[PDB]
């Protein structure tokens, strides 16, 4: 067998636990109440993602500012992709076992204009019937999907880690149970989806940001999350972001 542990199997053990939103089914739903409950859970998922990123082989070995810049760039990529996966494995957005955006909730005021981006991720995963190991490798790549225009401090080591996971993904595709004549075609499809995550997140962020800035909405963001959001709004208009593409 393989007493010699593969990278992807390590990605599997460090995968974060499922968190509950503590949402009270007994009080009637409101967009305002969901936005808030989701902000709270979200802040906690981001904290989880830090604990996750650090356990990813190679990541801790990057410069500390590198490590921060990448979580800063990618948190919503990871949130959106992990939700997509959860939802796929479940037609609903399964933010938490006790917070599923069902048909009724989907139709709440101002709700579909965000979830439909999440839904696309879920729908794409499902259409490509993406497997678990492919999902794991792909999520890691999403951590590494964006870098500063001017470059990272450990730009060299980053490139190695990222190429490493591109290969790890290739291995997952091949290892997948199907027909091998589709492998290069599948690798094309999967990175095509990774590529599409940029557009997705840009939308998710434009509606999460303006909601954060809306002085007339009174939605609570936890502190972990408010920091990142404030620190990002500048750069996201300063165009100092190189979004790495598999397909130009």
């Amino acid at each position: 067998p393989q007493l010699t542990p593969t990278l992807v199997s390590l990605l599997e053990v460090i995968e974060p636990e499922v968190l509950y939103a503590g949402y009270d089914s007994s009080v009637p739903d409101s967009t305002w109440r969901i936005m808030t409950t989701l902000n709270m859970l979200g802040g906690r998922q981001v904290i989880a993602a830090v604990k996750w990123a650090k356990a990813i082989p190679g990541f801790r070995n990057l410069h500390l500012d590198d490590q921060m810049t990448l979580l800063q760039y990618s948190w919503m990529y990871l949130m959106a992709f992990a939700l997509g996966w959860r939802s796929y494995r479940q037609n609903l957005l399964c933010f938490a076992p006790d917070l599923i955006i069902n048909e009724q909730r989907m139709t709440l005021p101002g709700m579909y204009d965000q979830c439909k981006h999440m839904l696309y991720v879920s729908s794409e995963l499902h259409r490509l019937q993406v497997s678990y190991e492919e999902y794991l490798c792909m999520k890691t790549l999403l951590l590494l999907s964006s870098v500063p225009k001017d470059g990272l401090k450990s730009q060299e080591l980053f490139d190695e880690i990222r190429m490493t996971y591109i290969k790890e993904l290739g291995k997952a595709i091949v290892k997948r149970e199907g027909n091998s004549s589709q492998n290069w075609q599948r690798f094309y499809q999967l990175t095509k989806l990774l590529d599409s995550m940029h557009e997705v997140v840009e939308n998710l962020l434009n509606y999460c940001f303006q909601t954060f800035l809306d002085k007339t909405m009174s939605i609570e963001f936890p502190e972990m999350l408010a920091e990142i959001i404030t620190n990002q709004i500048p750069k996201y208009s300063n165009g100092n972001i190189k979004k790495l593409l598999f397909h130009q």
Partner: peptide, 11 residues
């Protein structure tokens, strides 16, 4: 400017 993230990252 993000002490929390820095804190969480640096062990």
């Amino acid at each position: 400017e993000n002490a929390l993230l820095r804190y969480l990252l640096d062990k």
